[PDB]
């Protein structure tokens, strides 16, 4: 009984309004359809072979060498992963209504954040791998040695901790939306449309969490601190990406990878 829940409680936990449920369903299918979901075609997905990613040897300024071969294997699969993120965003109405200029900024802004989340939630405890591009299951050491350095460690620990959050497609979808609709970027026009779009998404997202009634204490603040986890991952990665670019030939960076991550 809703009225009793309402009286008895300390504060109120509103569930999604119809307008928000529409927002949630569009977001949920946006993410599902650009997730390399669990469909037929993606669930053909092999571990990265154990002899790859064990030979880090190209020196990076912070001392954490890079396995050239493992690196190449990851750049070889990264373009579709970046593209899927673009498709995700394009399928959100509040995104596509935005000036093209704003859209690029927003995607550059959050691409790694969304990719990292996407891997994070694909963390698998019995194998101790993340799944990259819906396809490649990799271990902590492999991804670490293959380019990402301590950014691998961060995604793994994020993925490990998210295990018990039992996120469903929606929660990951709305997390992405919150990440995407961020005004922590320079050079946007619709700084206010974007803030309002993030508010609506946060509002629908908490309201949805309310609906799910996870049996973790303080789920929503916790699920909010994960967002800053992700921004920190994105920021470490932007930094290691510049050092990736200093140390390695452009031949190894796929045009799109270069594009999403150049300043
Ligand atoms: C390759 C890759 C794919 C990926 O897929 C996310 C998804 O499922 O869409 C998610 C992550 C986190 C990575 C890893 C990655 C992410 C950024 C980056 O600069 C590098 C270089 C070492 C090639 C690797």
Author numbering: 145 to 407
Which passages does the manuscript contain on this structure?
In the second crystal form (C2 space group) Arg 228 is in another non-productive conformation (in white) which is an intermediate between two conformations of the same residue found in the first crystal form. Differential positioning of the Arg228 side chain is related to hydrogen bond with the Ser277 carbonyl group that flips the Arg228 side chain into an alternative conformation. To compensate this conformational change, a water molecule (W343) bridges the Arg228 side chain and the GC-1 carboxylate group. This weakens direct interaction with Arg228 and forces GC-1 into a new conformation which involves re-orientation of its carboxyl group. First, the GC-1 oxyacetic acid ester oxygen forms a hydrogen bond with the main chain amino group of TRα specific Ser277 residue. The Ser277 side chain hydroxyl participates in a hydrogen bond interaction with the Ile221 main chain carbonyl group, which is not available to Asn331 in hTRβ. This means that Ser277 fails to engage in a hydrogen bond contact with Arg228 analogous to that observed between Asn331 and Arg282. Thus, Arg228 is not anchored by contacts with the subtype specific residue. In the non-productive conformations GC-1 maintains the interaction with Ser277 but the strong interaction of GC-1 with Arg228 is lost, giving way to a hydrogen bond of this residue with the main carbonyl of Ser277. While hTRβ Arg282 binds to the ligand in a single conformation, hTRα Arg228 has the potential to flip away from the ligand in non-productive conformations, resulting in loss of an important interaction for the stabilization the ligand.
